[model samples]
Target: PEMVRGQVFDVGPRYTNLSYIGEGAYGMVCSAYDNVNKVRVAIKKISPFEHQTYCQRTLREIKILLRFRHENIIGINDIIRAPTIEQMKDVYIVQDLMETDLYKLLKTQHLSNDHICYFLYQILRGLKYIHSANVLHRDLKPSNLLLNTTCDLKICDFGLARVADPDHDHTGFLTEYVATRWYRAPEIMLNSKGYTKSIDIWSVGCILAEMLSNRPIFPGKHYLDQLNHILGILGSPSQEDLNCIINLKARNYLLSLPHKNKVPWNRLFPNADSKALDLLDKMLTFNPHKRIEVEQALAHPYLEQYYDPSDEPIAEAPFKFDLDDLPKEKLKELIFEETARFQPG
Candidate 1:
């Protein structure tokens, strides 16, 4: 996409490219009008096979998005590809158009406590199934959360996400870069071997804190900076907490630092409701194993008004998604399968 801002988008005739909204090294997205459905849609165009890592995550995202059908989970309406496999480029994913995302809203909009309560509830409402399916959303930052004007939130961007299971550790199974520094869980930042949906819980916790204060709860400049800010706020991890840091480097690194005491939640967010602070405190636990589960968080008093057991849908049961042994050719084959879904019979 040489994208001269108003150039013709090559996907097809149905989507009239209104404007080229954005372009980056990885891909380009444009706001297009869907004539058939008669609504505005955002189409993402990227080359999946250009890199092995991107190709692998690209397949998982394509497969995962198709399966998720909750009100709070992003729905990708269609996937299209270049006609020829030999050329091997350009994956087009068309999805719902959202007015703004949570990250952007946090910076520009004013929010009430009720807004915070329901928004967090919406995340857990959809996330229940995300975890039941044994999928770990490795990246769950504010920007990855999409929202409309009414604050209808849907979690998006599953590039760093993958499925895992019981009786196994996610350590060496996935890459080191799990999430954005500020929203990442302590175990992820501390180099713990095991990974699970609790990491997602921690992320929602960070989101809640940011919503409360309209600023990043942990604005770390670097890795050590991230750890220091968390430690400074939560207090230094106890020996029991240190035992969970499987990666020796971070284990020794933390042991060497001077100790700090926990800051009271009231002092941190003077205006926040007591219940809101209580839930935030539980979610940001130093140990992932101890962090609040999505179900528990939903039951907390903060979300009491909206919590409903029957409303939250449980997605597909936990199953294996063996992503190993994928070289470029396998990635190419799998990626094409997704594109074929949109092709004519």
Candidate 2:
């Protein structure tokens, strides 16, 4: 096993100064040096105000993340609870730091099929593991895929994830507030009865197409617009599918939409092989019932014929870092750095 330098530390104890990395609606993330182990760790601190209202969902997500341990999934390190009201600024979940997200890297990286296949295979493996455990990662866009310098990918952010029993329906589990518009699946937009893990398959298809095309396949402005854009590319749902959808949402705007046939797979991905195109079709299928499962997807012809798992290393990183290493001085430094970067001169 690889030696880990960081040790578990208290929330207020600062062993090394922290540097601000990024921020989002959930919380701010920072990098802190683990003095004992001599390594870097990423710490995400969620505001207490935010937690008081969203604690249940946040805690649920953390619990789900802890249950999963795989090469392609991000690992959770330590969870630190605030002792005082002031300290309760956020719940800090610390873990290994990644250099960038797949979205930013795709902007400039001249991707090779070998690399794409490798990355995608790992994604499928991780998804397969999660689905088998009855978990659904509602947010699965390229931006959520953190990567290190080695091109190793880890699926992160379980805040939107929920328990999805494949044996049961999931349309009721869905809310308008769920998945980002562009990545949202067909059933989610048309059928309000609750969707299922199939929604994830659809999103994976979008991610694959986006990665291959080097652009988002559906860049819809609004929810309705997103639906229209998806229809334009993959064709509208059939009468039966639309009827089922109407039964759930009590609306039929989808029926009035014009239908179109799917664009040829080859035309969609000129550079990719036949196997890749075939996999993309099954993944992007309009019928949720016929949508591919993660396990089936992992076993697809595309993977069997083209995927080379041996090319990448199999040794996995720890799911998360331990506490007892965090310090207050580090957080202050990180906050200062963040202020300096965002402050306008």
Each model's lDDT: 0.80, 0.68
Provide the lowest-lDDT 10-residue window in model 2. Answer: 1-10
Candidate 1 regions exceeding 4 Å error are 1-8, 165-175, 244-249, 322-324
State every prediction's TM-score relative to the real structure: 0.92, 0.79
C-alpha root-mean-square deviation, candidate 2: 9.5
User: Could you give the C-alpha RMSD of every candidate to the true structure, in order shown?
Assistant: 2.5, 9.5
- Tens digit of lDDT per residue, candidate 1, span 51-152? 887787788788888877889989889877766688657788899999888989999976899888888999888889788778878778788889987889
Question: Using TM-score as the measure, which candidate wins?
Answer: 1
- 1-345: candidate 2 lDDT, tens digit per residue: 111233232343432577777777776677877665577888776653433334534554566666677778898765555444345454667677899988898887867887778778878877877676666788899998989999888998886776664454534323465568788876676554233688788888998888788888889998677777787878866676655553544244666555687667688788887777788888888778887877778778777753444442332431322122334544433323322321234
The TM-score measured for candidate 1 stands at: 0.92
